[PDB]
Structure 1
């Protein structure tokens, strides 16, 4: 699709077998989701945003279907205000900014 930007670009995602919604965020290097269960080993990481740093758990090679499109990559879990799909997964669906 072509998504205009008059409202937040929220889309349906499927992760962990569950439907959620998340913000397509070209300003985020990687993907950060609110607290949830994911498979595999996690590693502690710090990530920085506009207001400072937060602690997250990093999971590797996680499957996420974004508007029906498959992506596999790193997913961070932590106290983000909103679920964010960052560039590491946007690239996997061929997302581009067009003007």
Structure 2
């Protein structure tokens, strides 16, 4: 679809069999989700935001559905204030900015 930006671009995502709300975040290189339980193995990693760096759990090759569009990529899980869908997954669903 075409999404205007007078409101937050929030979408329902499907991950690990559970639905969640997440923000389509073109300023995020990576996808970062709030604390949750995901199956499979993970490795500790660091990510930086506007306020500094946080420790996260990196799950690779995770199946995630975004507005019915399927993606398989890295998902970082940690103390983010907001579930954000970053460019690593926005590219998989064919997302672009237009003006």
Shorter-normalised TM range:
over 0.9
Q: Tell me the distance in 2 between the aligned counterparts of 1:21 and 1:57.
A: 19
How far apart are 1:62 and its partner, in Å?
0.2
| TM-score normalised by structure 1 residue count | 0.98
How far apart are 1:66 and its partner, in Å?
0.1
Q: Structure 1 stretches of 5 or more lacking a match?
A: none
Q: Tell me the distance in 2 between the aligned counterparts of 1:42 and 1:17.
A: 18
How far apart are 1:42 and its partner, in Å?
0.7
* Secondary structure of residue in 1 paired with 2:92: helix
Q: Tell me the distance in 1 between the aligned counterparts of 2:26 and 2:87.
A: 6
* Secondary structure of residue in 2 paired with 1:92: coil
Q: Structure 2 stretches of 5 or more lacking a match?
A: none
Which residue of structure 2 aligns with residue 61 of structure 1?
Answer: 61
How far apart are 1:38 and its partner, in Å?
1.1
Question: CA-to-partner distance for each residue in 1:9-43, whole Å, 9 max, x for gaps?
Answer: 00010001111110000011110000111121111
How far apart are 1:7 and its partner, in Å?
1.0
| TM-score normalised by structure 2 residue count | 0.98
Question: CA-to-partner distance for each residue in 1:56-86, whole Å, 9 max, x for gaps?
Answer: 0000000000000000000000000010000
Number of residue pairs the alignment of both structures matches: 99
* Secondary structure of residue in 1 paired with 2:46: strand
